[PDB]
Structure formats: structure tokens, C-alpha cells
Design a protein around this ligand. Structure first.
Ligand code: CHL
Ligand code: CLA
Ligand code: CLA
Ligand code: CLA
Ligand code: CLA
Ligand code: CLA
Ligand code: CLA
Ligand code: CLA
Ligand code: CLA
Ligand SMILES: CC1=C[C@H](O)CC(C)(C)[C@H]1/C=C/C(C)=C/C=C/C(C)=C/C=C\C=C(C)\C=C/C=C(C)\C=C\C1=C(C)C[C@H](O)CC1(C)C
Lengths: 222, 193, 81, 219, 39, 214
């Protein structure tokens, strides 16, 4: 186990060997093993989506703060890309539906029957791409072109993926909540916090602590 | 045994096998043997590029050799800035895949691809090759290299931070500190914002 | 906000209440005196089960697919037809 | 053994091995062995530091009678103060961690790290630090700790006398010798039920904040 | 104290405590957020 | 046996004299269950230590204010004065910081109560022995007891435990007195003591005007 999320608590035995495990399941969602396998895949998929999304938000924002690029902010990039997009909105949705239906059905079929997308005659001659590794959530093949899963740092890279994945998931939800609460981008929120941490935080954004539910805010003030 | 802190406990995985082994690992970073081998190679690589960088920064007449090193990219050459980046990327890609393949399987990249008679001698270490990389038989010397590499790494970091806060060249920083050291140093300069 | 979101909120709380009650009843079924826990409440157990009812849809859906949510028809009493 | 309270009883954890041991520990602060060793090192360094401080303040009062020792840092021979702080911190850090790893690992810090020190006692360096010894070991240890405790008490007196009088130690002694009945703390400070007379502190509140040490609880 | 807490765990006492909590929660929500018709 | 709170009455049978401050006082038998009794022992210790710190932080600033050296506000006004003097520090930010810090330390104390010595595994910054705990409500170690007054001798530890529990109960009663006296006089406690010292036969609860609303 990587550790204990709550020192002194009794950690569940079914999480003892999973990568990235801190024994954290107070709601007992993963007590059933089939549920646990499904949730391991779901956590990895959420982690990788959030990882790529937080990269595609933070790196343009960091390079914009450094004066390098001037790409649009993340919550308005849909509008600016759509006007210049040669493909209209409805066609983009239909294409995304088709492509993700295909790839997610292939991933789902591999989850139910491991290695079944790599068998002979499975794909149209290209089935060697998708042989799998016998590990839930770690496909390999085309998805591991450099073959770094065969190296000796593979187990530590699994742990690195999950913890960075959880951090990225929290970060994207923070991006969305910060936009909804302040109306500014994430780097501007960080700079405002760095300028005055006591006064520039969630307790003063006027949304996170609703005024009706917290009457002492309008009272205990200068 | 020499150590960075005489009189303290030494980690059990650092027994002087490696050069420059003074038991310095307060954060216990490289514990598993794959990590320690990778960080050995990375220390060698970063230290050698930092030795070259410290030399090339301290060495710099001529209009080009009067420019700051952090403003050096704005000098005009025979190619646009994009072209040299990709050419350097290509040459580095070739030599780095050679060095990486040596790092994975030792002795795998020892033979000249176009000359079958020209081959690096066997028993080659990953970070310590032989043959045409050692034209003289100069090979105690690894402690010297790792010490100069670490000093150059700290020097290059000092170049980067000094050009970031004061906005000054390294020679200007040394001359400012040599004017009055008790007022022109990291204290006072940063305390004057 | 008029009916649909209240429908989701009610159904979440109602499934929470029902799942907590079912969990408490199942846990009490294994005691030596199962009827005693029905009118003298095991309050720490009830509070623990009540807290765990937040994750009810996941557990209930897994019981549905696994086949453990429902008792088999051969184990349930019926009157003569 | 001579005891701080004759006719009394020394505590069990104070056997008498340490120099200047008179069985004075009513709080039981040294009733742990490793705490007793650490507190012995602390008392030694406090004694020597207060000893040098009392000597230096007395000399500064004698030599430069126009300079208040409390405000002696205003008159010290403007951004160069930060560099001197850096030099002092570096040198003090080096010598202090040398002493501390002498304490933690006895004999490990007993060799010159540039070009050696004899085997000695923890807290008693010897070697180059002790070139001449005009006496015996236990006797001079007793003198060192007694003079050190006297100097610690004297430095506390120097500080609080500077607060309540605004003047140096020998000037305060001269004021006491001029009027022995109207210069003591009993002479100017009185608290009775219903009325308290608290003498003011002549040191200003700030210059850098310069608070009088617990002046609101003065008698 | 064990017998007293067993009495406090009898069904009507638990019902009283739980419904006092639930009714108080509903009352205080409607005091702090008066007249909620829609979400 | 030992001295009891009501002489001539047998002490409460579930109290046996092992706990510090055991005078046999439990007329409602709230400590009948031993585990609930250990929980109430930790409750009493936390209440008493908090009361001692708070009573010190009221009495010493009020004594210094009464002397005229400083102008620290009375304890019932200090939050208002602080908020009026700190407009760049909002009340909610201060409350959030206090809640997360006390949550960390109190959850560590709670988990040690549930599993004694379980915070000794080195998860918090490598701390092992200093978080093991000596007894229920008495952590000890080199962090909570850095002068080592619990590791000297047994009788010294029992003496200090008696001192702690008796001063803690006195400070709890004193804070109750602070609340009652402020409600009855509208002044601070040192102001009350000074008014009583100036004229004791006239300055009594009977003449404050609210204890006897006749
Ligand atoms: C994670 C997906 C996602 C999220 C969070 C957003 C969020 C946003 N987009 Mg973008 N978009 C997203 C995906 C896409 N957008 C666009 C195209 C645009 C345009 C053209 C514009 C935006 C704008 C906006 C903002 C307007 C708010 C809004 O309308 O709510 C939408 C809220 C969402 C949560 C997104 C949609 C719901 C969901 C996340 C879709 C994906 C769910 C899966 C398909 C479910 C599949 C089920 C499986 C099990 C079979 C908002 C910040 C605009 C705005 O800023 O106005 C100035 C703007 O003009 N988006 C496309 C191309 C088809 C997407 C493809 O996935
Ligand atoms: C979760 C992954 C994800 C998603 C949904 C997006 C979404 C988007 N990106 Mg981002 N991006 C990502 C990952 C992602 N990016 C990562 C990991 C990086 C590297 C840091 C970037 C770097 C990036 C840049 C530099 C730009 C975008 C732009 C865009 C927008 C237009 C994309 C387009 O026109 O398709 C083109 C389809 C291809 C197949 C090519 C769109 C809102 C553009 C924008 O902001 O406005 C137009 C833009 O200039 N992205
Ligand atoms: C464990 C609690 C529990 C659960 C999971 C169910 C579930 C069900 N009930 Mg049963 N019911 C309960 C308690 C419960 N009931 C009690 C206490 C009574 C006596 C009032 C009934 C009387 C009853 C009737 C008369 C009918 C049902 C029906 C149903 C079914 C449809 C849902 C419904 O109509 O809800 C309606 C539920 C009620 C009207 C009573 C609910 C009372 C509370 C809210 C539930 C009890 C909570 C419990 C005390 C929590 C303790 C847990 C704690 C200690 C941890 C479903 C099988 C219907 C049917 O059979 O459908 C096919 C039907 O006609 N129920
Ligand atoms: C604990 C040791 C200690 C410390 C921290 C100080 C601190 C100080 N002293 Mg003393 N002093 C000491 C011991 C100490 N003194 C001893 C042992 C002697 C006798 C050798 C003196 C004799 C002395 C004199 C005669 C004077 C000082 C002065 C000073 C100040 C400036 C020193 C300087 O500029 O030197 C740079 C080298 C500074 C506040 C000077 C002053 O400005 O304040 C009174 C001053 O005139 N010191
Ligand atoms: C007047 C106070 C006083 C006395 C009686 C002593 C006495 C002693 N010292 Mg200390 N010491 C003092 C003040 C004193 N010291 C101060 C102010 C410092 C800081 C500068 C020190 C720092 C010190 C060190 C670093 C060492 C001693 C050592 C010694 C011992 C032998 C050296 C000697 O004979 O000194 C005679 C002193 C006078 C005649 C005056 C002896 C127990 C040595 C030791 O501990 O054991 C060998 C040793 O290594 N002392
Ligand atoms: C158990 C249900 C319950 C809950 C969740 C709350 C919740 C709350 N009460 Mg409420 N209260 C309750 C029952 C409850 N009360 C009952 C039965 C009474 C007596 C009739 C009160 C009398 C009461 C008063 C007098 C006050 C609260 C206040 C509060 C708030 C801060 C404490 C909070 C919203 C305080 C407030 O409104 O916000 C600061 C406040 O002054 N309550
Ligand atoms: C099935 C019948 C039914 C339904 C659907 C409702 C629905 C509602 N009632 Mg009516 N009501 C009913 C029966 C019903 N009531 C009966 C039988 C009576 C007589 C006792 C009343 C007497 C009554 C009064 C006097 C009031 C309501 C109000 C409300 C609203 C409460 C909203 C709320 O508190 O959000 C809060 C959301 C939650 C508490 C969700 C829980 C979230 C947790 C904490 C998480 C809601 C529209 C109030 C409203 O203002 O009307 C528009 C109002 O003042 N009800
Ligand atoms: C239970 C313990 C307790 C509590 C809740 C308080 C509460 C308070 N005290 Mg009090 N105090 C205490 C114990 C306590 N004190 C003790 C034991 C003494 C002695 C004092 C002496 C004291 C004085 C002399 C003053 C206060 C003041 C204050 C107020 C401001 C606190 C502040 O600014 O933090 C200060 C925070 C820091 C210094 C930073 C934290 C340090 C970390 C490491 C960073 C606040 C109402 C002030 C006041 O009354 O109004 C403003 C004031 O002047 N306290
Ligand atoms: C009358 C006050 C008093 C006394 C006699 C004790 C006694 C004890 N405490 Mg306790 N304690 C107190 C107040 C006290 N405490 C307060 C206010 C707090 C909260 C800050 C604590 C929190 C605490 C912890 C967390 C621990 C103890 C422990 C101990 C034990 C060893 C330390 C010791 O002997 O201190 C002796 C006390 C004195 C000599 C009196 C000091 C009076 C000061 C100097 C006044 C300061 C006033 C200033 C304005 C504040 C011993 C049983 C340790 C343990 O239980 O051992 C296993 C332990 O881990 N205490
Ligand atoms: C009892 C208990 C036990 C445990 O504990 C758990 C729990 C969960 C709690 C529970 C369970 C249960 C059961 C299983 C259920 C199932 C059922 C049936 C089968 C359904 C059908 C069948 C159903 C179906 C028909 C349905 C529905 C449909 C309709 C149209 C709807 C509509 C809509 C909605 C959307 C909403 C909105 O707003 C409106 C409307 C318009 C109204």
C-alpha cells in the first residue's frame, strides 16, 4: 500500500495491492470485486482525461502569463474555435459521437474479455495493435509506443499516473468552480491570491459562502 | 569515510560504490536501484552540460560577444530561429538514442554503423564510454569530474537566478559584490525589492 | 428547477433512506436476537449505516447486476392458489 | 555535599557528578537523564555567553560612558548591517553545528576538517581551547559554573535595571550608592490591595519595536 | 448509564430525536431561505 | 478511603481513586461505563486546559490594562475590536484557518483515542515516538512534554496530574464566574475585583442590580 489516508484507521483489505491505494473507501463502493475493477478503469480514464485537459488549460495559460502565446481562455475557447472551424457544430458532435462510440466499445469489450480485441480476426488485420497486457486499465501496444511499460520503473509510473491524475481531476473541478465563482481565469485567480491571501480567497468571492446561510458575514465586518 | 555531515547517520544504500558518494540523500530520493542508476546517469548528463554551459557563459571583443547571454538569441545569424532548433533536435535525437540504447542494454551501441571494424572497446560503463570518446589514455578521476560537475551545476543555477532577480550579467554581479560585499549581495539587493 | 431537479434530489434522498433501512435490517438479521435491534436501535451501527447511504446508487446497481438484491421466488412464502 | 538549602534533601536524580551540583531542582526539570545532559550543555553555554556579556557591558560602560548599552546598536560603526548579519549567521551556524555534533556524537567532531583534538569530555573541549590551566579540573569547573551563574543573574539585572532606569549598570550602582533608601525597587514600586504604583520604563516603545519586558506586570 | 442509554435507544426516543432533528432542519432552512418554490 | 466531595457519603462505586482528581463525585453516575468514563476524562482534561489558557489570557491582559500600561480591550469586546482593526483579514478566513488547524490536531487526538498509539507510525513528517502517548489524556513525549516532567518519576507525575486537574477545574469555575459577572455588571473581571477591593461591603452581588432585581 502507498499509505494510509487516515492514520490509525482500519484500512479495507481489498485495497491492499492496488496501485495508488491509501485505503480510502469510507462508503465501501469497492467492496465488491467486479465493482472495484470497473472503478479502477473509471478512475484511470477520468485521470487521463483530466490530465490532458489540465495540461491544455494550464500550459497555454502559463505561456500567456509569460507573454509567449495569446490563446483564448479555456471557458471561451469553444466560441472562438467554432467560428474559424471549417466543420460546423452539429457535424462535430456527430463525428465525436461516432468516434467515441467506436473506441469506447472497443475499450469496453477488452474490459469484459481481456485480450479479445487483439485476437486473430478481431480487427481488420490490425489486431496486433490491441493485444492488451492482461492488466485492467493499461492497454499498451499502440498506446505504449516507446515500450516503457516493459522497463523496471513501470510500477512507480503507475503510482505517478494515479496521483497526478487525482491532482488533475481536483484541478479541473477547481478551474470550473473558480470561473463560476470569480469570472476570471485560473492564473488571474492565483495571482490575486498571491497578492493578498487573507482577503482574496473563497470566503470573499460572494458565492462559496451564501449570505443567507451565513448571517455572521454581514455582521462581523468593519 | 568522507561524508557531507560528519557525525550523522548515513543511508544504507550509499556505500561509496558511486563516485562522489558522501551519503548525501536527506529526502531519500533514489532508493530503488533503477532510480539510483537513472539519477546517476542524469547527474552525469546534467553536470557535463552544466560544465559546458558555465564555460560558455563565463567565456563570453566582437558585437556578438558583447551581448548578454540571456539576450543572445536576438543576434542575427544566417538562419531563422526555427531552423537551428530543428537541426539541433535532429542531431541530438541521433546521438541521444545512441546513448539511451547504451543505457538500456550496455555495449549495444558500440559499433560504427557504417564501419564494421571501428568499435568502442567492451566493458564500457553507461556514463563512462571509451574509444574515440577517450582519444588519450587518461584513465580518482571520477571524483574530480563529479565535483566539477556539481560546482558547475550550482554555478549555472546561480547564473540563472542572478540574471532573473538583479537582471545582470555574471561578471556584473561579481563586480557589484566586489565593490562592497556587505551591501551588494543576496541580502539588501532583494530587500530593496 | 421546478420539478426535474427536485425529482433527482428526492429520488437520491429516498434511495438513501431505503438503502440505510435495508442495510440495518440485513445487519440485524445475523444477530442472535434479530427482533431486539428493531425496537431497541443499535444507534452507533445506525449512524454508521446512515452515513454510508450516500453511496447507495453504486451499491444497489451492483446488487442488481450481481443478482443479490432480490430473494429467489423459491424461498418466499405464498398462499395456495 | 554543600546544598542550596542546608539541612535539606537533594533530589534523587542529582547525584553530584555534574560540576556546581547543590541539589537544586525543585521543579524536577533535570529528572530525565538525556534532558539533564542537554540542560547541562545549555547551562554551560548560557553561563559563558552571559559571562562575556556582563564583561562587555561593564567595559563599554567604563570605556564609552556616552553610549547606552541598550541602544549600543544605534551607535555601532546603512545596508551593510545585513551583510554583517550574514557573516555572523554563517560563522555561528558552523561553530554551533560543530558543538552540537560534538554533543550528539562524542569524538566525531574531534578532528580538524582542513588539515586534531584530544579525547575529552562532552561540553569541555580542551585541546587548543585549553592551552593553559592554572588549577585543577573540578575546582576550575566549579569556579566557571559559579561565575557563570552570577553573570546570568547579573545580565538579568542589567536588562531590567536598564528598563526601569534608562541608564547603565554602573550609573545605577552610583545612584544606589548616592541614595540607598530611595533607589531600590522597594522604594519606587508598591502594590497594596486597592492601589498599585508601577514605575515607568524610560526606554521608548519603538525605534523596530522595543517593548519593555512584561511592563504591565511590574510591581 | 448503560441502562439509561439503552432506554434512549428505544424506538420512540430515537424517533423523537430524529424527527426533532429533521423538523428543526426543515424549519431552519425555511427560516434562512424563506419561501422556496423552485430550485 | 480517600477524601470525598461530601464527607460521610460513600464515593460513587464506579470511581476507585486511580484517576487524578477522584473525590468520588458522580451523583448522576455519568461515568458508569468505563469507556464513556475514559471519554469523559479526556473531555474534562481538554475543557480544563482550555479554561486555564483562556483564564490566563483574560486575567493577565486585564491586570496589565488596569495598571494603565496598555489598553487591551476586555475579553467580551476583543473580537469586535480586532475585526474593526483588521479590515484586510476577514472573519470567515480566520474561522476557516482555525477550523482546519483544530480539525487536524483534534482528529489526530480522536484517532489516538479510538486506537491508542496509532499515530506513532511516522505518517506525519516521520514523528514516531512523540505521538505514541503515555495514557488517556496524557500524551507526553518529547514534543508535548519537552522538559520531561512526566518521565522523571511516578510520584512527581501524580503530583503534577493532581495540580493540573485541580487548577483546570478552578479555571472552569472561574470562567463561569467571568460570564456571570460580565452579565451582572457589564465590566471586566479585574474591574470587578478592583471595585470590590475599594469598597467591599458595598460592592457585592447584592448591589449590582441584576442578581437581585427588586
Ligand atoms: C467536457 C466537455 C465540455 C465542457 C465542460 C464544455 C464547457 C463549455 N463550453 Mg464547450 N464544453 C465541452 C465540450 C465541447 N464543447 C464544444 C463546443 C463549444 C462551443 C462552440 C462553445 C462552447 C462553450 C463552452 C462553455 C459554455 C457553457 C455551456 O454551454 O455548457 C456546456 C456544459 C458541458 C458540461 C459540456 C457539454 C456536456 C458534456 C460534458 C458533453 C460530454 C459528455 C459525454 C459526451 C457523455 C457521453 C455519455 C457516454 C456514457 C456514452 C462552457 C465553459 C461556449 C461558450 O463559452 O460561449 C461563449 C461556446 O461558444 N463549447 C464541443 C464541440 C462539439 C465539445 C466536444 O466535446
Ligand atoms: C482533453 C484534451 C483537450 C481538449 C478537449 C482540448 C480542446 C481545445 N483546444 Mg487544447 N490542448 C490539449 C488538450 C485538449 N484541448 C493539450 C494536452 C495541449 C498541450 C498543452 C493543448 C494545446 C492547445 C493549443 C495550443 C490550442 C488548443 C485549442 C483547443 C480548442 C480547439 C481545438 C481544435 O481546433 O481541434 C483541432 C483538431 C486537431 C485534431 C488538431 C479546443 C477548445 C486551440 C484554441 O485554444 O483555440 C482555437 C489552440 O490554439 N489546445
Ligand atoms: C427499511 C425500510 C423500508 C424499505 C426499504 C421499504 C420498501 C418498500 N416498501 Mg415498505 N414499509 C416500511 C419500511 C420500508 N419499506 C415501514 C416501517 C412500513 C410501515 C409504515 C412500511 C409499509 C409499506 C406498505 C403499506 C407498502 C410498502 C411498499 C414498499 C415497496 C415500495 C416503496 C414504497 O412504497 O415506500 C412506501 C413506504 C412507506 C409508506 C413507509 C416508509 C416508512 C419509512 C420512511 C421507512 C422506514 C425507515 C426505517 C425506520 C429506517 C431505519 C434505518 C436505521 C435504523 C438505519 C418497497 C419494497 C409498498 C409495496 O409493497 O410496493 C410493492 C406498499 O404498499 N411499505
Ligand atoms: C557578547 C559579546 C559582545 C557583543 C555582542 C558586543 C556588541 C557590541 N559592542 Mg562590546 N565588548 C565585549 C563583548 C561584546 N560586545 C567585550 C568582551 C569587550 C572588551 C574587549 C567589548 C568592548 C567594546 C567597546 C570598547 C565597544 C564595544 C561596542 C560594541 C558594538 C559594536 C562592536 C563593533 O563595532 O566591533 C567591530 C570590530 C556592539 C553593540 C562599541 C560601541 O559602539 O558600543 C558601546 C564600543 O565602543 N565593545
Ligand atoms: C572566569 C570564568 C571562567 C572559568 C573559571 C573557566 C574555567 C575553565 N574553562 Mg571556561 N570559558 C569562559 C569562562 C571561564 N572558564 C568564557 C567566558 C568562555 C567563552 C570564551 C569559556 C570557554 C571555554 C572553552 C572553549 C574551554 C574552557 C575550558 C575551561 C577549563 C580549563 C581552562 C582554564 O583553566 O581557564 C581559566 C580561566 C581563567 C583563569 C579566567 C576550566 C574549567 C576548557 C575545558 O572545558 O576543559 C579543558 C575548554 O576547552 N572554557
Ligand atoms: C435540531 C434541529 C436544529 C438545527 C439543525 C438548527 C440549526 C441552527 N440554529 Mg436552531 N433551534 C432548534 C433546532 C435546530 N437548529 C430548536 C429546537 C430551538 C429552540 C426552539 C432552536 C433555537 C435557535 C436559536 C434561538 C438560534 C438558533 C440558531 C441556529 C443556527 C446556528 C446554531 C443553525 C442554522 C441561531 C441563529 O439563528 O443563527 C446564528 C440562533 O440564534 N436556533
Ligand atoms: C407531497 C406534498 C408536498 C410537496 C411536494 C410540498 C412542497 C413544498 N412545500 Mg408544502 N406542505 C405539505 C405538503 C407538500 N409540500 C403539507 C402536508 C403541509 C402542511 C403541514 C405543507 C405546508 C407547507 C408550508 C407552510 C410551506 C411549505 C413549503 C414547501 C416547499 C419546501 C421547499 C424547501 O423546503 O426546500 C428546501 C430543500 C430541502 C429541505 C432539501 C433537503 C436538502 C438536504 C439538507 C441536503 C416545497 C415547494 C414552503 C414554501 O415556501 O412553499 C413554496 C412553506 O413555507 N409546505
Ligand atoms: C485559549 C487561548 C486564547 C484565545 C482564544 C485568545 C484570544 C485572543 N487574544 Mg489572547 N492570550 C492568551 C490565550 C488566548 N487568547 C494567553 C495565555 C495570554 C497571555 C494571552 C494574551 C493576549 C494579549 C496581550 C492580547 C491577546 C489578544 C487576543 C485576541 C487576538 C488574537 C491574535 O491576534 O493572535 C495573534 C496571532 C499571532 C501572534 C500569530 C500566530 C503565531 C503563529 C506561530 C504564526 C483574541 C481575542 C489581543 C486582544 O485582546 O485584541 C486584539 C491582545 O492584545 N491575548
Ligand atoms: C496548572 C497548570 C498545569 C499543570 C500543573 C500541568 C501538568 C501536567 N501537564 Mg498540562 N497543560 C496545561 C496546564 C498544566 N499542566 C495547559 C494550560 C495546557 C494547554 C496548553 C496543558 C496541556 C498539556 C499537554 C498537551 C500535556 C500536558 C502534560 C502535563 C504533565 C507534564 C508537564 C508538566 O509537568 O507541567 C508542569 C506545569 C507547571 C510547572 C506549571 C506551569 C505554569 C506556567 C509557567 C504558567 C504560564 C502562564 C502563561 C501566561 C501561560 C503534567 C501532568 C503532558 C502529559 O500529560 O504527560 C504525560 C502532555 O503531553 N499538558
Ligand atoms: C425498495 C428499495 C430496496 C433497496 O433498499 C434499494 C432501493 C433503491 C432503495 C429500493 C429498491 C427498489 C426497486 C428495485 C426499484 C425498481 C423498480 C421498478 C422495477 C421500476 C420500474 C418501472 C419504472 C418506469 C415505468 C418509470 C418511470 C417512467 C416515467 C414516464 C417517468 C417520467 C418522468 C420522470 C423521468 C421524472 C420527471 O420529473 C417527471 C416524469 C414525467 C414523471
Amino acid at each position: 500500500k502507498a499509505g494510509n489516508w487516515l492514520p490509525g484507521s482500519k484500512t479495507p483489505a481489498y485495497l491492499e495491492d492496488l496501485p495508488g491505494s491509501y485505503g480510502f473507501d469510507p462508503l465501501k463502493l469497492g467492496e465488491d470485486p467486479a465493482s472495484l475493477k470497473w472503478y479502477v478503469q473509471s478512475e484511470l480514464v477520468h485521470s487521463r482525461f483530466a490530465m490532458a485537459a489540465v495540461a491544455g488549460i494550464l500550459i497555454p495559460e502559463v505561456l500567456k502569463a509569460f507573454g509567449a502565446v495569446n490563446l483564448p481562455v479555456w471557458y471561451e475557447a469553444g466560441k472562438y474555435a467554432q467560428e474559424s472551424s471549417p466543420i460546423p457544430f452539429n457535424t462535430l458532435i456527430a463525428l465525436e459521437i461516432f468516434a467515441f462510440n467506436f473506441v469506447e466499445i472497443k475499450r469496453w469489450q477488452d474490459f469484459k474479455k481481456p485480450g479479445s480485441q487483439g485476437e486473430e480476426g478481431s480487427f481488420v488485420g490490425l489486431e496486433g495493435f490491441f493485444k492488451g497486457t492482461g492488466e485492467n486499465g493499461y492497454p499498451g501496444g499502440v498506446f505504449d509506443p516507446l515500450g516503457l511499460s516493459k522497463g523496471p520503473g513501470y510500477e512507480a509510473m503507475k503510482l505517478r499516473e494515479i496521483k497526478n491524475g487525482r491532482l488533475a481531476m481536483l484541478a479541473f473541478i477547481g478551474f470550473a468552480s473558480q470561473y463560476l465563482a470569480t469570472g476570471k481565469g485560473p492564473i488571474e485567480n492565483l495571482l490575486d491570491h498571491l497578492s493578498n491571501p487573507l482577503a482574496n480567497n473563497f470566503t470573499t468571492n460572494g458565492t462559496s459562502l451564501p449570505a443567507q446561510a451565513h448571517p455572521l458575514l454581514s455582521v462581523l465586518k468593519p | 569515510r568522507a561524508s557531507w555531515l560528519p557525525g550523522s547517520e548515513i543511508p544504507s544504500y550509499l556505500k561509496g560504490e558511486l563516485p562522489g558518494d558522501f551519503g548525501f540523500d536527506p529526502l531519500r530520493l533514489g532508493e530503488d536501484p533503477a532510480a539510483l542508476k537513472w539519477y546517476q546517469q542524469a547527474e552525469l548528463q546534467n553536470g557535463r552540460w552544466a560544465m559546458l554551459a558555465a564555460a560558455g557563459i563565463l567565456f563570453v571583443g566582437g558585437p556578438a560577444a558583447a551581448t548578454p547571454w540571456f539576450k543572445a538569441s536576438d543576434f542575427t545569424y544566417f538562419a531563422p530561429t526555427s531552423t537551428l532548433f530543428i537541426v539541433e533536435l535532429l542531431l541530438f535525437a541521433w546521438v541521444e538514442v545512441r546513448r539511451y540504447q547504451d543505457m538500456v542494454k550496455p555495449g549495444s551501441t558500440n559499433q560504427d554503423p557504417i564501419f564494421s571494424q571501428y568499435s568502442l572497446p567492451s566493458g564500457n560503463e553507461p556514463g563512462y564510454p571509451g574509444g574515440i570518446f577517450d582519444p588519450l589514455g587518461y584513465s580518482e578521476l571520477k571524483l574530480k569530474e563529479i565535483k566539477n560537475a556539481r560546482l558547475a551545476m550550482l554555478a549555472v543555477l546561480g547564473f540563472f537566478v542572478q540574471a532573473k532577480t538583479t537582471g545582470k550579467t555574471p561578471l556584473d554581479s561579481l563586480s557589484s559584490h566586489l565593490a562592497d560585499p556587505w551591501s551588494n549581495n543576496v541580502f539588501g539587493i532583494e530587500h530593496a525589492r | 428547477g421546478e420539478t426535474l431537479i427536485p425529482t433527482v434530489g428526492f429520488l437520491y434522498i429516498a434511495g438513501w433512506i431505503g438503502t440505510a433501512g435495508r442495510d440495518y435490517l440485513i445487519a440485524s438479521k445475523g444477530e442472535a436476537k434479530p427482533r431486539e435491534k428493531e425496537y431497541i436501535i443499535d444507534v452507533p451501527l445506525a449512524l454508521k449505516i446512515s452515513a454510508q447511504g450516500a453511496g447507495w446508487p453504486f451499491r444497489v446497481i451492483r446488487e442488481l447486476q450481481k443478482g443479490t438484491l432480490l430473494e429467489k421466488d423459491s424461498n418466499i412464502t405464498v398462499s395456495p392458489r | 555535599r554543600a546544598l542550596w538549602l542546608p539541612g535539606g534533601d537533594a533530589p534523587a536524580h542529582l547525584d553530584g557528578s555534574l560540576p556546581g551540583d547543590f541539589g537544586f531542582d525543585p521543579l524536577g526539570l533535570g529528572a530525565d537523564p538525556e534532558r539533564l545532559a542537554w540542560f547541562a550543555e545549555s547551562e554551560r553555554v548560557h553561563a559563558r555567553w552571559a559571562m562575556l556579556a556582563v564583561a562587555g557591558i561593564a567595559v563599554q560602560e567604563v570605556v564609552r560612558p556616552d553610549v547606552f548599552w541598550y541602544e549600543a546598536a544605534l551607535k555601532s560603526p546603512p545596508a551593510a548591517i545585513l551583510g554583517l548579519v550574514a557573516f555572523e549567521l554563517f560563522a555561528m551556524h558552523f561553530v554551533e553545528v560543530r558543538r552540537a555534533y560534538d554533543f550528539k556524537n562524542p569524538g566525531s567532531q574531534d578532528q580538524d576538517p582542513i588539515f586534531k583534538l584530544p579525547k575529552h569530555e562532552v561540553g569541555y573541549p580542551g585541546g587548543i581551547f585549553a592551552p593553559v590551566i592554572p588549577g585543577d579540573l573540578a575546582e576550575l569547573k566549579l569556579k566557571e559554573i559559579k561565575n557563570g551563574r552570577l553573570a546570568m543573574l547579573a545580565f538579568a539585572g542589567f536588562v531590567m535595571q536598564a528598563q526601569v532606569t534608562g541608564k547603565g549598570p554602573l550609573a545605577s550602582l552610583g545612584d544606589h550608592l548616592s541614595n540607598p533608601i530611595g533607589t531600590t525597587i522597594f522604594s519606587k514600586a508598591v502594590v497594596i490591595p486597592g492601589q498599585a504604583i508601577v514605575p515607568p520604563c524610560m526606554i521608548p516603545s519603538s525605534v523596530i519595536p522595543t517593548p519593555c519586558f512584561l511592563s504591565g506586570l511590574w510591581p | 448509564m448503560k441502562n439509561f442509554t439503552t432506554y434512549l435507544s428505544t424506538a420512540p426516543v430515537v424517533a423523537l430525536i430524529w424527527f426533532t432533528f429533521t423538523a428543526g432542519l426543515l424549519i431552519e432552512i425555511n427560516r434562512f431561505f424563506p419561501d422556496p418554490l423552485v430550485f | 478511603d480517600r477524601q470525598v466531595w461530601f464527607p460521610g457519603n460513600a464515593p460513587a462505586p464506579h470511581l476507585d481513586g486511580s484517576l487524578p482528581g477522584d473525590f468520588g463525585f458522580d451523583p448522576l453516575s455519568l461515568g458508569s461505563d468505563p469507556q464513556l468514563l475514559k471519554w469523559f476524562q479526556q473531555a474534562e482534561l481538554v475543557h480544563g486546559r482550555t479554561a486555564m489558557t483562556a483564564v490566563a489570557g483574560i486575567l493577565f491582559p486585564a491586570v496589565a490594562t488596569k495598571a494603565g500600561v496598555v489598553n487591551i480591550p476586555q475579553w467580551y469586546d476583543a473580537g469586535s475590536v480586532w475585526v474593526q482593526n483588521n479590515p484586510n483579514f476577514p472573519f470567515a478566513a480566520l474561522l476557516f484557518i482555525q477550523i482546519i488547524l483544530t480539525g487536524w490536531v483534534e482528529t489526530k487526538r480522536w484517532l489516538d483515542f479510538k486506537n491508542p498509539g496509532s499515530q506513532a507510525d511516522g505518517s506525519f513528517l516521520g514523528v514516531t515516538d512523540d505521538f505514541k502517548g503515555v495514557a488517556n489524556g496524557y500524551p507526553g513525549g518529547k514534543l508535548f512534554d519537552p522538559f520531561g516532567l512526566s518521565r522523571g518519576s511516578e510520584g512527581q507525575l501524580q503530583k503534577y496530574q493532581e495540580n493540573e486537574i485541580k487548577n483546570g477545574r478552578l479555571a472552569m469555575v472561574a470562567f463561569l464566574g467571568f460570564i456571570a459577572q460580565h452579565a451582572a455588571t457589564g465590566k471586566g473581571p479585574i474591574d470587578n475585583l478592583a471595585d470590590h477591593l475599594a469598597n467591599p461591603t458595598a460592592v457585592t452581588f447584592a448591589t449590582n442590580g441584576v442578581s437581585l432585581p427588586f
